[PDB]
């Protein structure tokens with residue numbers, strides 16, 4: 446289920462984070478603008494940029510905490526508020542987070558593994574709803 450999936454992802458988080466974030470940027474090339482430093486790079490080049498591995502793993506570190514603190518795939522409002530309020534998310538709208546979770550669910554569906562892809566899909570929708578409620582455009 447969802448909680449086991451948190452444990453699975455955490456057991457190889459650096460590689461899951463990079464592969465899911467690459468799936469996101471490759472599915473939605475326009476999203477690299479938020480990361481202008483990732484333009485004109487192949488997957489292998491990106492996985493050799495310090496900020497790429499460091500920042501992507503920190504994104505998923507916090508994403509797993511938010512997933513872990515959720516009840517029935519509904520995140521804490523306090524977690525939503527942190528994500529809306531972070532200076533690094535100044536630019537963003539809910540659509541950015543929706544696209545990331547579409548890529549994450551697709552990744553899970555295409556993997557050989559028994560991820561509860563349906564729970565992650567609900568988690569993404571519930572996080573987008575919570576981000577809107579916490580004042581993301």
Ligand code: HEM
Nearest residue numbers: 476479480499500503504505507508533534537541542545
């Ligand atoms: C649940 C989803 C997400 C979580 C938990 C999250 C978390 C974080 C964290 C912890 C950082 C700080 C990383 C660091 O400074 O090393 C960060 C930075 C950032 N996040 Fe997010 N993030 C999420 C989704 C997104 C999405 C969807 C976008 C854009 C589409 C985005 C854009 C950024 C940007 C531009 C930065 C700063 C630039 C950079 O770190 O290189 N994040 N995020």
Ligand SMILES: CC1=CCC(C(C)C)=CC1
Nearest residue numbers: 466480496497500501504
């Ligand atoms: C915060 C943050 C930094 C870098 C990445 C890369 C995987 C593109 C993701 C989000």
